[PDB]
């Protein structure tokens, strides 16, 4: 029987992973707000990255009821990660920090 789910009904499912991401020591910091190309002086960002995503956007979507299915949220988390792996060199802090978050995402899912 078809139904719109309340944010709380999905919070139980999604919040454990989201909290694990936010908690990471310095590693979540480049992901806590949208990438701001003006501020950061990287005017090509949106040439490379067409669908930006960050943790504040994921949290807002959760809390407003925009995730109705977990696959939507998992898609979003991986979009954020793939955007970073795509734009940033393998050598960069942002890239390696992204990798740490991905590792944390997977471990939290599968202990
Ligand atoms: C996610 C992503 O792609 C991205 C994030 C940033 C970026 O600098 N985000 C950011 C935001 C905030 C808080 O507002 C903190 C940090 C940050 C990184 N390390 N730290 C610890 C010193 C305290 C904080 C951060 F990297 C960035 C910069 C970029 O520009 C750049 O690296 N240069 C050299 C121009 C390019 C991409 N990003």
Q: What's the CA gap between 60 and 6, in Å, rounded? A: 14
Q: What's the CA gap between 81 and 13, in Å, rounded? A: 20
- If phi over 0 gives left and psi between -120 and 50 gives alpha, with beta otherwise, what is residue 80? alpha
Structural domains counted in the chain: 1
Ligand 1 atom nearest 33 alpha carbon: 14
Experimental method: X-ray
Classified as helix, coil or strand, 71 is: helix
Q: What resolution (Å)? A: 2.6
CA 35-78-40 angle, to 5 degrees, is 15
As for ligand 1, residues whose beta carbon falls within 6 Å of it are 26, 29-31, 33, 35, 40-42, 84, 87-88, 94
From the list 17, 75, 91, the residue with the least C-alpha distance to 83 is 75
What is the dihedral sign for C-alpha 50, 54, 102, 96?
Answer: positive
Structure tokens at 31: 């992901």
Q: What's the CA gap between 26 and 74, in Å, rounded? A: 22
Q: What's the CA gap between 58 and 74, in Å, rounded? A: 10
Which residue segment(s) compose the domain that 87 sits in? 1-111
């Amino acid at each position: 029987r078809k139904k719109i789910f309340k944010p709380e009904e999905l919070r139980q499912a999604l919040m454990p992973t989201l909290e694990a991401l936010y908690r990471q020591d310095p590693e979540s910091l480049p992901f806590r707000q949208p990438v701001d190309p003006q501020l950061l002086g990287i005017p090509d960002y949106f040439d490379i990255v067409k669908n930006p995503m960050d943790l504040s956007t994921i949290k807002r979507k959760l809390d407003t009821g925009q995730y109705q299915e977990p696959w939507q949220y998992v898609d979003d988390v991986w979009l954020m990660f793939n955007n970073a792996w795509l734009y940033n060199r393998k050598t960069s802090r942002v890239y390696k920090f992204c990798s740490k978050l991905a590792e944390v995402f997977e471990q939290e899912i599968d202990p």
